[PDB]
Design a protein around this ligand. Structure first.
Ligand SMILES: CCOc1ccc2ccccc2c1C(=O)N[C@@H]1C(=O)N2[C@@H]1SC(C)(C)[C@@H]2C(=O)[O-]
Ligand SMILES: CCOc1ccc2ccccc2c1C(=O)N[C@@H]1C(=O)N2[C@@H]1SC(C)(C)[C@@H]2C(=O)[O-]
Lengths: 150, 150, 48, 400, 150, 50, 50
């Protein structure tokens, strides 16, 4: 900075403290009362939701091996497992609607073959619906899967 | 839509090699259709004002709303928006030994908003009670305040 | 005619009443295709 | 009985579900610090940990970032609940968890801590809820817009009226430390106005200087000051600006210390100043009634004060204006299609009053239990018209 | 560093007069905090292509950029697609070789943040902490000792 | 449709004017399309009656 | 440049809305060619020069 008369040197450390710290101290997180940071990813207005979240684990997976000692990933606030439950408790309800219909077809008509034509009728229509929604533009939403049950 | 983007994503590269006067001035890339359709006149009957008071009110209330609504190409103001207008007398400058350069420096100093910090900053000391924002220089408002620039 | 005009959506509720018909409406015409084709066949080919 | 079980049946959009995840926010009063809001964020984390071990897997607190905006007053904890299997009853479900959580934060606390559901949907579509906004159309200032908003909130709360609930979005109004620098005093001693503006700006607020390199990746360099020399108003005079005559000059010489009153969040709607009013409909009234009974309060306000509805809500709703039009055309075409395959003026009418047969039963199960006319129930009606027409067309086809 | 009404008419208002000539538009909101952060939200009609709609908004901000403070130009100006709500919020902690709530926030922003925002179309990433930076803390008493300023 | 929404913004601006300020309408394209619909659908009815 | 043609200096505030500030000159001192000499530029030696 300066060179005062007698050959003395005024350095930047002599007038000021110098530490390598953050650029913004306005916010600091705490995972269960433990010093932590994070990455709050938000959607891109029209993105594919879970397909975006699948590729969040794509980059993250290649980052894991090159961490220092102690650094570990944890998963709070997650949207991923809710869609896995909406598929597993609707396709499960799909199977419960076929088995219950199987008992009604057997009580009224004792023929085993008669409780079989409607059993192959509705699964064929369920698959055909996926082909129409793919050809037009829609996806496997929470709404359109509830349409398969109704 | 896409044709407008390509034209203004190329002007951007040539912007740094233009005069600094033209950069701060209005550079615009708008869709054109050589011809008007709606041309809304604005007059006064009772409480009479000039052809300048009316042109300011049009540009400071209904011009910004019109150009933004229902996809307007480009709006042409028939007059002008108000502005702190100064008329330097050359004889009075020579009286006190001054130039137009010294007048421009006085407005780019006193008429200017400064970004001061804040009491109890971003990294405070543990135990601070208060936290408020500091105000410093404020942009001048009326014609009287511009007259008292030293 | 009950479902498709109900799926003429208006506003932020766009894909709500929309997807609430066209989804199941394709299933109607695929079940009428499964009742005009297929079901006729399987009943004659193999029943009692 | 079909009409009576419809009007009285309330109107929602979509049920707020258990999503295995919720959150809660924080708000401290005028001019709070990072240390004060951290005390509130700790007590919230303890209710979810020690007093709720069975239902909460983890927490993710944050100091100075709410979903309103930003500042040292705000905050947000992100709860991640345990799996669905380990939470059996309705007590261990998001509705009951956020119920007794809000009670605990209003009892043993001296701030504004809450806890809201995870709606799905978006921020809009609350049902029996609106979003108003108060615009300054004329050339009034901030101080004049503040008085107009206080007269709108007061008038709503003073003559209800199948009542209401109205509060501002975030204009709590805190003090601001102004420093009047006398220009003629400065130039007399010989100090530049440029030097003084980056002495106050860089020291207290900070300043972006230049880019440097750290371990390969290019980062930023910031210059500010040790924390203790910029906490209180008395530390202004400690900074000495250099003059042209080679001697120091304190800040107290030319400056002047005095407090003021500003706002920490200036909102603007469509090129003009504005202030968001977050109010909802009554328990009795519902949307259409509440909005038109807030419009005549806006007209009674002083001159240069208009309004505009901001800003998710709406354009045309679902159980409102839309549904009548959807069911209307649904009858028109159903009648026409029961004629291309039938040929009469009697067959269509037989199918056209099996509609209220299936509808009285649908409205019976929804109104009896704790459900409502939302999206899932509304389309459950049209499936019933397809199954009442189906069964009745078997009665008409074989019989003819 | 700037307060609420400083950023209200030096950054915010300048963009608002130059936020015109856009195809499709319902309304425009705005915010301006005392921390020194402005955020406008130009809402469009229902499902208006977010690709082309993003370009028109940032091909207009560009014209108003020269009339802003030089501090704001070098700072982060961003036009991103928004969806008010998070989905994946990946926490990051330490167990063995313990470090602070600052060392962790730098490693997140200098390895996994640039990769996440770029992958599978992310709207905008919010770092819960801060990236490292050569931080200096000027002592005012030591400056006066050798006759110096910031 | 663009000219219809020019009157949308303009209509909300009218009440907050000062004393004397009034809107007037020269050079207008709007009424020409209203005449092109009313003297073609009128010609439509004259073709059916004849 | 500033006297005859005008010059964009800085932004100020007027009744809420941010507008521009322009510096030029009274009309009578910039009409004819003879009014060029009326402007006196300052030199480093503290005296005026036509
Ligand atoms: C989150 C819903 O906060 C609500 C909602 C509805 C209400 C009806 C009546 C009385 C109070 C409230 C509150 C209420 O007490 N909140 C207080 C407040 O201050 N804020 C809150 S919410 C907020 C985050 C928008 C804002 C802030 O912190 O900036
Ligand atoms: C006639 C069959 O119109 C259909 C049928 C199916 C669709 C499936 C998806 C998306 C659209 C459609 C439309 C369709 O063209 N309608 C619309 C159109 O234009 N838009 C809609 S939806 C929208 C909000 C994405 C967008 C917009 O308003 O900008």
């Amino acid at each position: 900075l300066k060179v005062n008369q007698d050959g003395s040197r005024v350095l930047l450390r002599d007038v000021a403290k110098i530490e390598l710290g953050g650029e913004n101290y306005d916010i600091i997180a705490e995972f269960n009362g433990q010093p932590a940071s994070g990455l709050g990813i938000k959607l891109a207005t029209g993105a594919n939701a879970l397909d975006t979240a699948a590729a969040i684990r794509a980059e993250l997976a290649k980052m894991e091996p090159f961490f220092p000692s102690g650094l570990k990933i944890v998963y709070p606030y997650d949207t991923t497992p809710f869609v896995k439950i909406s598929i597993h408790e609707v396709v499960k309800t799909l199977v419960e609607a076929i088995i219950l219909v199987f008992l009604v077809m057997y009580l009224f008509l004792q023929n085993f073959r008669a409780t079989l034509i409607p059993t192959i009728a509705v699964p064929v229509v369920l698959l055909g619906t996926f082909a129409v929604l793919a050809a037009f533009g829609f996806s496997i939403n929470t709404l359109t899967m509830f349409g398969m049950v109704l | 839509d896409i044709a407008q983007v390509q034209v203004q994503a190329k002007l951007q590269l040539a912007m740094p090699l233009l005069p600094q006067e033209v950069q701060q001035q209005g550079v615009s890339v708008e869709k054109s259709s050589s011809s008007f359709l709606m041309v809304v006149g604005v007059i006064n009957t009772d409480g009479t004002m000039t052809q300048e008071d009316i042109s300011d009110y049009v540009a400071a209330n209904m011009k910004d709303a019109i150009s933004r609504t229902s996809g307007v190409g480009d709006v042409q103001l028939f007059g002008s928006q108000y502005a702190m207008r100064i008329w330097m007398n050359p004889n009075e400058l020579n009286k006190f030994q001054l130039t137009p350069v010294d007048v421009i420096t006085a407005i780019k100093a006193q008429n200017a908003q400064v970004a001061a910090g804040q009491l109890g900053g971003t990294p405070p000391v543990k135990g601070q009670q208060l936290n408020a924002s500091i105000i410093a220089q404020t942009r001048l408002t009326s014609t009287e305040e511009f007259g008292k620039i030293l | 005619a009950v479902f498709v005009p109900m799926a003429f959506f208006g506003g932020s509720t766009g894909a709500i009443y929309r997807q609430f018909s066209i989804t199941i409406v394709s299933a109607m015409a695929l079940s009428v295709l499964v009742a005009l084709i297929l079901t006729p066949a399987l009943c004659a080919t193999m029943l009692k | 009985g079909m009409a009576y079980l419809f009007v009285r049946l309330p109107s929602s959009f979509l049920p707020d579900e258990d999503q295995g995840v919720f959150m809660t926010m924080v708000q401290l009063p005028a001019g709070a610090t990072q240390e004060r809001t951290q005390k509130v964020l700790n007590e919230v984390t303890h209710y979810y940990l020690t007093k709720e071990k069975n239902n909460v897997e983890s927490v993710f607190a944050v100091n100075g970032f709410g979903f309103a905006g930003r500042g040292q007053n705000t905050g947000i904890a992100f709860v991640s609940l345990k799996d669905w299997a380990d939470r059996p009853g309705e007590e261990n479900k998001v509705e009951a968890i956020t119920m007794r959580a809000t009670r605990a934060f209003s009892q043993i606390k001296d701030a504004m801590v809450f806890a809201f559901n995870l709606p799905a949907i978006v921020e809009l579509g609350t049902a029996t809820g609106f979003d108003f906004e108060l615009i300054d159309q004329a050339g009034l200032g901030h101080e004049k817009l503040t008085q107009a908003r206080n007269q709108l909130l007061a008038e709503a709360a003073k003559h209800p009226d199948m009542l209401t609930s109205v509060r501002p979005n975030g204009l709590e109004d805190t003090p601001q430390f102004k420093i009047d620098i006398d220009q003629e005093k400065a130039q007399a001693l010989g100090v530049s106005i440029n030097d003084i503006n980056t002495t106050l700006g860089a020291a207290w607020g900070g300043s972006y200087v230049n880019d440097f390199i750290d371990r390969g990746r290019v980062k930023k360099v910031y210059v500010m000051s040790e924390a203790k020399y910029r906490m209180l108003p008395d530390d202004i005079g400690d900074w000495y600006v250099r003059a042209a005559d080679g001697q120091m000059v304190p800040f107290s010489a030319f400056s002047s210390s005095r407090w003021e009153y500003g706002s920490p969040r200036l909102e603007r709607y469509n090129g003009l100043p504005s202030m968001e009013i977050l109010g909802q409909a009554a328990p009795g009234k519902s949307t259409g009634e509440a909005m038109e009974l807030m419009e005549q309060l806006a007209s009674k306000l002083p001159t240069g004060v208009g309004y505009d509805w901001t800003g998710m809500s709406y354009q045309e709703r679902l159980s409102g204006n839309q549904a009548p039009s959807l069911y209307a055309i649904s009858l028109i075409v159903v009648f026409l299609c029961l004629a291309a395959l039938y040929e009469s003026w009697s067959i269509p009418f037989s199918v056209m009053l099996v509609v209220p047969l299936g509808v009285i039963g649908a409205l019976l199960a929804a109104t009896f239990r704790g459900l409502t006319n939302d999206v899932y129930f509304q389309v459950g009606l049209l499936t019933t018209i397809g199954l009442s027409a189906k069964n009745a067309i078997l009665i008409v086809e074989f019989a003819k | 560093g700037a307060d609420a009404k400083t950023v209200q008419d030096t950054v915010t208002q300048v963009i608002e007069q130059n936020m015109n000539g856009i195809d499709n538009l319902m309304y425009m909101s705005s915010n301006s905090d005392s921390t020194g952060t402005v955020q406008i939200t130009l809402t469009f009609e229902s499902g208006t292509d977010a690709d082309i709609a993003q370009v028109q908004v940032q091909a207009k901000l560009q014209l108003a950029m020269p009339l802003l403070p030089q501090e704001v130009q070098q700072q982060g100006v961003s036009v991103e697609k928004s969806s008010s709500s998070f989905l994946m919020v990946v926490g990051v902690i330490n167990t063995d070789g313990t470090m602070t709530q600052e060392d962790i926030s730098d490693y997140v922003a200098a390895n996994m943040k640039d990769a996440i925002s770029r992958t599978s179309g992310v709207g905008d990433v919010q770092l819960f902490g801060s990236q490292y930076a050569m931080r200096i803390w000027m002592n005012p008493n030591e400056l006066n000792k050798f006759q110096l300023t910031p």
